Structures are given as C-alpha cells and as structure tokens.
Ligand binder design. Structure first.
Ligand SMILES: Cc1cccc(CN(C)c2ncnc3[nH]c(-c4ccc(CO)cc4)cc23)c1
Length: 311
C-alpha cells in the first residue's frame, strides 16, 4: 500500500517501544469543527479530499491561520475511515519536524473526522520543477544550490521518518510539497491523490502501486522497509536533477521492465546532476537493500556537497 506505516524494527539504533496504530487516539489534538471555514479543494481521490481552510484559535497562541484539512468523502467505506485514523495516530506519534507536513489538530467528534495539517503555499515539487524546465525553452532560473536544498530537505524528512521506524511507501517528486521559502516538506498525501486514474500507479492485482519508484524487493517480494524508501529517494533525486522528467523515459511498465530492473538496469545520469549526486542515486539503487546508504548517510554527504557549492 501507499500509506505511511510504523514498522517494528530493532536492527541498529532504532527501538520500537510502541506501534501508535495499535492504540486509540490522543484527544489533545481536538479542535472545534465550527472554528474552521473551508475553501477550495487542494486535491481529491477515490475516498478522500483535502481543502484549504482558516482555523480560528488553533494552538496555544490562539492564532488565526491558513491550514489544510483532510477528510473522507461521505462515500468512504469503514476501511478508509480506519486508514485516516491510523494516519492521524502516526502523525500524533511522530512529533514535529521542519521537513514534514505537521499535524496541527483534528476534529473527530460531532461529525466526520477532519485532520488539520500545515498548509504549504507553493504546491508540489514536480510541477514546480516542470515549470522551471519549461521556462528555459522560451522568475529567476534554478541553480545547483536550489536542487541541493530540495534534496537535503527531503532527505532530512526521510531521516526523521527512519528514526521513528516509519516507512513512507510513495517517495516521489509529486509527493513533495513546497512551503514558505520553497522549503520542501513530506507527508502522507494518499487522500489528495487520484490514484485510480493516474498512469504512474500500476495495477498489481489488489493494488495500484508506483512501480517506477519502487525497489525490486518491493515489486517482487512485497517487502517494504526503510531501505526500500531509500531506493525511491534515488528515483526522486533523478526527478529533481532532470527538472522533472518521467522516470525510465519511454519504457513501458511490463515484464521487460521488471527484468531490466532485476538485472541491474539504472537510469542514466541527469543532465544537471554532478557526478557526486549521481553517485547517491547509484548507491540508492543497489540491488541488495543492505548495501544502500541510510538517510543519515545521504544527509551528511549532501551537506558536504552544499558546502562545496558555497565555497
Ligand atoms: C502532494 C499533493 C499534491 C496535490 C495536493 C495535495 C494536498 N495536500 C495534502 C496539501 N497539504 C498541505 N498543503 C498543501 N498545499 C497544496 C497546494 C497545492 C497547489 C498549490 C498551487 O501551486 C498550492 C498549494 C496542497 C497541499 C498534496
């Protein structure tokens, strides 16, 4: 599936004390439903939708501020309701981070469940990159430092998720939002996503899966770990440094594609990727999951590349 999920892991430095999806919910997040006014839809899919809203008296500082609200369609089945409560429980457990779309509140009584999160004013990274690529063909252009920042910001978010044993399962430039200062943030964006009508999501029987982004062990063996997410981050880095090309350009998803990937096929270096950045992608794409870098290793290598650019 493409929802965030806490996994049980002791390998290395992580320690699972509790799975927050196993327990009911923390009523500290409750917020008055009548103190939201809804605006336009930011996105929608099969069972859910996200709308921008103003929240009146949210948090200790009693601020008025613009937020995003996630909710199910009235047509949603119980399993969809459960999945939303699960996401709320995970987000209540993770704690805040600058590169996550943070939870701010929920409304879980007196009507349908609303999940209130930070609002990101610049929209998705992929469309941002594609507009900056388009501009080159006919304001200010991107620089290497901007692409390094985006890469670092996402890797810091992912390093945070990894430290809490949270797997993402849909890492892709389309699932990165940009907020004030064009800082990147990640979140579980499944509800905003029209997955059933998106050709990037391939039928795999029960499921619709972002196969071009997925580790071989995820595709073949239904294994889903942090190191699976590392593979996907490599695909994302390719998207960033290509200014938003579609992965595996012109290659159809089918049996030849699965065999390519299993046999060690890797996308070519993007035009705007330095060799050192391509080396991150190649490492993320190690066929053996244990030979891939950790998100912390990625973060600390990217921080060196950033210093070099600054010099
Ligand atoms: C990844 C993705 C893609 C589409 C919709 C969403 C909705 N969500 C969860 C959001 N969650 C939080 N903040 C948000 N800000 C926006 C947003 C979308 C477009 C634009 C116009 O450029 C601006 C903002 C979507 C959003 C998320």
């Amino acid at each position: 599936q493409v929802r965030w999920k806490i996994i049980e892991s002791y390998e290395g430095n992580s320690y699972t004390f509790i799975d927050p999806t196993q327990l009911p919910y923390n009523e500290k997040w409750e917020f008055p439903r009548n103190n939201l006014q809804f605006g336009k839809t930011l996105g929608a899919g099969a069972f859910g939708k996200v709308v921008e809203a103003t929240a009146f008296g949210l948090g200790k500082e009693d601020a008025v501020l613009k937020v995003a609200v996630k909710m199910l369609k009235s047509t949603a089945h119980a399993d969809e309701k459960e999945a939303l409560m699960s996401e709320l429980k995970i987000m209540s457990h993770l704690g805040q981070h600058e590169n996550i779309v943070n939870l701010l509140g929920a409304c879980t009584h007196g009507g349908p469940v609303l999940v209130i999160t930070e609002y990101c004013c610049y929209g998705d990274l992929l469309n941002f990159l594609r507009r900056k690529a388009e501009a080159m063909l006919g304001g200010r252009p991107l620089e290497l430092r901007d692409l390094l920042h985006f890469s670092s910001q996402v890797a810091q978010g992912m390093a945070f998720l990894a430290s809490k044993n949270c797997i993402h399962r849909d890492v892709a430039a389309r699932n990165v939002l940009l907020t004030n200062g064009h800082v990147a943030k990640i979140g579980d964006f499944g509800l905003a996503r029209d997955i059933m009508n998106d050709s990037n999501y391939i039928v795999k029987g029960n499921a619709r899966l972002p196969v071009k982004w997925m580790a071989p062990e995820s595709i073949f063996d239904c294994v889903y770990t942090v190191q699976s997410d590392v593979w996907s981050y490599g695909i994302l880095l390719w998207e960033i440094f290509s200014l938003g090309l579609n992965p595996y350009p012109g290659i159809l998803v089918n049996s030849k594609f699965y065999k390519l990937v299993k046999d060690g096929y890797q996308m070519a270096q993007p035009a705007f990727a330095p060799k050192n950045i391509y080396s991150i992608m190649q490492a993320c794409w190690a066929l053996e999951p244990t030979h891939r870098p950790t998100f912390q290793q990625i973060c600390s290598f990217l921080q060196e590349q950033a210093q070099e650019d600054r010099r």
